[PDB]
């Protein structure tokens, strides 16, 4: 046991210094040849009422007008941002819902919270009514977030501290991810959507792949719980979300933390994280019932949204980067352009 | 402006929007309370007596009393981070919290139970988003309590205790120490009550704390509290 | 899905009729219910709308006042009661559903029908009759007097097949939407008002009756309908 801990401690001091050998000059003094982004003004465009309990989770759809979000009242309803019609609502079993996801495609949307099964509902039935399709049940805790790989397998996170794969014709974990300390977050898939990182509570991210199911690379530099992430357009790098007031990149080709983004007057955590699609501005759902927009590059506040009446619990920005929406839970939601 | 089919769509989530009015004009009058404590407290008790009066997750059980609607949540099983998730439940009306009073004795592989359930109590009850959720205690355990007191002291529980070995003094010390941990008494009250073989005494106090809690929250609406 | 109409026969001039139709195997609630009847050698005609929940309710001017349309959604049976009847009324009422939202597909499914017999945009089609061989390609044009395109950027444009002895088959909605369960071979495009429905080969499977409908006002109007057949 001693020999086993002296070996890991010195692969990890080995780790450290490779990392900080590559640290040959930092994001900050590259960018600072470059103007900086001027004053972002963002106006509320339309607000999504009809949600009568807190916003917990929204996805947007691959065509950048539909998009589903999940409340606590346990109602899915699935906006279309062009003109603010529903055009479903789901009545969840379970009211307790803290993730939602919509799939690629558009024909299926996951969910899962409390209830430790996660409810695939199809919405191109040929009945006419939204019916819960699959159940996938297993999860020892709660689901904290979902993403569609594919038309045929999905990935979902609990609080158990282990990701699992389920494919959807047949209902079985297949790919069990381990090795989380604490409880994963949150979800981003790759554009590729061969590798997707994960945040725990455990102030650490760990990149995974989808074939292969192991750790492929471990990030750190947290002072707190890892609230959310998301990955890069590019994809060769992450933002991170946490309870500290303060957003870090990381890059999977570099392996350590490339900008640290935080400010004096903000001393709350964070509730979601997004990306523009061209990847020069960043959005942060802070507690303070505001939203910011950060510089990628020099970690200036580019802007701030307007606001909302209660903490801003998720955002996510089109997949053309037209309008980016942000959820409160003031159960009001609201588009920005 | 709106074509033939764009005033349809409209027509349609006017109608979701009213049935989504409906539902929750429907939901808001039952009511919702937190059921907490640890598994040898007696909550499987009161939840089957609770039942006959009227698989990893959350139970949720569904009751009425006096015709008024309960909706009670089981979070025990949910062994994982309440901090990250306690906060689903800021909306709640009541929590109850059910302590083992005869465990005074007992060893937890804190080592005691009382302290860790006190711990616990402290937690919850001090909480940042139970500032004004009313609390209700339960004592599941106080027949066994009565048993065991005649041979085995307080003392070894709460050695500063010095009062009477009689069941009526530990009982009113042990009610007293629960309940001076309410930092919190300007804003929100904590319901005691003695569990018994009998249950409707249980089921008719958990429904005045509600009514109680009730009543504050109608005068709190209409600006009066 | 299955809808079973009930009530015709032979009817009197000034005589009544009550027509029942049954619907069965999904949610009758939310979609909605249009009546469309097709008199011997002669194309489809819109007669009467009812909403989800009978919020709105449309009528045909060639109908409106005479006819009178009702909706059942606990007992998920929609009635048509007629109290006058001329000689043009005779033909066959088919139950369609239609149901309203982004991405829908309404007029997907269409009724078997009743036979009843008594003792506005306009649509128009160059070709009626086009004698083809299987296999080689087919193209029906289709012109329409008002542009069905509308302000938000989509076209209202519908087509239906319906083969000897079967109720029409919507191919293509929204002339850029290919219907659930109708095969690939079927396009469909246009450019403000001149339509073209292209097929890649004909089938066996393709011989019937193809019917133009607008969506862009309520008064819809049907083609005379392009005939296919080996």
């Known amino acids: 046991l001693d020999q086993l801990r002296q070996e890991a401690e010195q692969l990890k001091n080995q780790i450290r210094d490779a990392r900080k050998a590559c640290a040959d000059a930092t994001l900050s003094q590259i960018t600072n040849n470059i103007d900086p982004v001027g004053r972002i003004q963002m106006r509320t465009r339309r607000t999504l009422r009809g949600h009568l309990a807190k916003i917990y989770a929204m996805h947007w759809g691959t065509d950048s007008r539909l998009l589903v979000s999940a409340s606590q009242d346990g109602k899915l309803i699935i906006w279309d941002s062009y003109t603010t019609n529903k055009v479903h609502a789901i009545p969840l079993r379970s009211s307790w819902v803290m993730t939602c996801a919509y799939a690629p495609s558009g024909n299926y949307v996951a969910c899962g919270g409390l209830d430790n099964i996660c409810s695939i509902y199809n919405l191109k039935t040929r009945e006419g009514n939204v019916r819960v399709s699959r159940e996938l049940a297993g999860h020892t805790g709660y689901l904290s977030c979902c993403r569609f790989l594919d038309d045929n397998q999905i990935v979902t996170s609990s609080g158990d501290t282990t990701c699992a794969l389920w494919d959807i014709e047949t209902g079985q974990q297949t790919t069990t991810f381990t090795g989380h300390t604490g409880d994963v977050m949150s979800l981003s898939l790759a554009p590729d959507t061969r590798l997707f990182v994960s945040g725990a509570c455990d102030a650490s991210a760990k990149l995974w792949d989808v074939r292969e199911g192991m750790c492929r690379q471990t990030f750190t530099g947290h002072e707190s719980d890892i609230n959310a992430i998301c990955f890069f357009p590019n994809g060769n790098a992450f933002a991170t979300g946490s309870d500290d007031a303060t957003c870090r990149l990381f890059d999977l080709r570099a392996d350590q933390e490339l900008m640290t983004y935080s400010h004096d007057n903000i001393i709350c955590g964070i509730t979601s994280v997004s990306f523009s699609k061209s990847g020069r501005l960043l959005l942060a759902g802070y507690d303070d019932f505001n939203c910011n927009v950060w510089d990628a590059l020099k970690a200036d506040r580019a802007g701030v949204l307007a606001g909302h009446d209660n903490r801003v619990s998720c955002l996510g920005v089109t997949d053309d980067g037209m309008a980016v929406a942000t959820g409160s839970w003031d159960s009001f939601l609201k588009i920005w352009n | 402006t709106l074509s033939a089919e764009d005033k349809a769509a409209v027509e349609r989530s006017k109608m979701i929007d009213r049935n989504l009015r409906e539902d929750g004009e429907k939901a808001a009058r039952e009511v919702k309370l937190l059921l907490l404590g640890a598994g040898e407290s007696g909550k499987n008790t009161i939840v089957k007596q609770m039942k006959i009066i009227h698989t990893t997750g959350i139970v949720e059980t569904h009751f009425t009393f006096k015709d008024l609607h309960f909706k009670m949540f089981d979070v025990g099983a949910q062994r994982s981070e309440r901090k990250k998730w306690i906060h689903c439940f800021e909306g709640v009306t009541a929590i109850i919290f059910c302590v083992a009073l005869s465990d005074y004795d007992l060893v937890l592989a804190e080592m005691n139970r009382m302290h860790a359930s006190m711990k616990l109590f402290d937690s919850i009850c001090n909480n940042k988003w139970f500032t004004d959720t009313s609390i209700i205690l339960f004592l599941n355990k106080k027949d066994l309590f009565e048993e065991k007191i005649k041979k085995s002291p307080l003392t070894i529980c709460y050695p500063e205790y010095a009062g009477s070995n009689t069941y009526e003094e530990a009982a009113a010390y042990i009610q007293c120490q629960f309940e001076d941990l309410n930092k919190r008494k300007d804003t929100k009250e904590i319901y005691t009550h003695f569990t018994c073989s009998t249950d409707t005494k249980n089921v008719q106090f958990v429904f005045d704390a509600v009514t109680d809690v009730i009543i504050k929250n109608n005068l709190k609406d209409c600006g009066l509290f | 899905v299955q809808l079973v109409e009930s009530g015709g026969g032979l009817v009197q001039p000034g005589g009544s009729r009550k027509l029942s139709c049954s619907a069965s195997?999904?949610?009758?609630?939310?979609?909605?219910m249009h009546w469309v009847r097709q008199a011997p050698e002669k194309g489809l005609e819109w007669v009467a709308y009812?909403?989800?929940?009978?919020?709105?309710?449309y009528y045909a001017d060639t109908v409106k006042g005479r006819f009178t349309i009702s909706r059942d959604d606990p007992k998920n049976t929609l009635f048509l009661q007629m109290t006058s009847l001329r000689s043009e009324d005779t033909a066959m009422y088919y139950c369609?559903?239609?149901?309203?939202?982004?991405?829908?597909?309404?007029?997907?499914?269409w009724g078997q029908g009743t036979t009843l017999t008594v003792s506005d945009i306009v649509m128009t089609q160059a070709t009626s009759s086009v004698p083809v061989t299987p296999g080689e390609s087919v193209s029906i044009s289709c012109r329409s007097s008002?542009?069905?395109?509308?302000?938000?950027?989509?076209?209202?444009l519908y087509w239906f097949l319906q083969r000897p002895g079967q109720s029409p088959q919507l191919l293509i909605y929204?002339?850029?939407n290919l219907a659930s369960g109708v095969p690939d071979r079927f396009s469909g495009s246009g450019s403000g008002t001149a339509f073209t429905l292209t097929i890649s080969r004909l089938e066996a499977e393709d011989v019937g009756v193809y019917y133009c409908?607008?969506?862009?006002?309520?008064?819809?109007?049907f083609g005379a309908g392009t005939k296919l057949e080996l």
């Open positions: 369609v559903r239609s149901i309203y939202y982004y991405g829908s597909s309404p007029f997907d499914f």
């Open positions: 195997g999904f949610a009758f609630s939310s979609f909605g």
């Open positions: 009812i909403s989800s929940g009978s919020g709105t309710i």
């Open positions: 008002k542009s069905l395109l509308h302000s938000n950027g989509n076209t209202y």
């Open positions: 929204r002339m850029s």
């Open positions: 409908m607008q969506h862009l006002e309520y008064p819809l109007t």
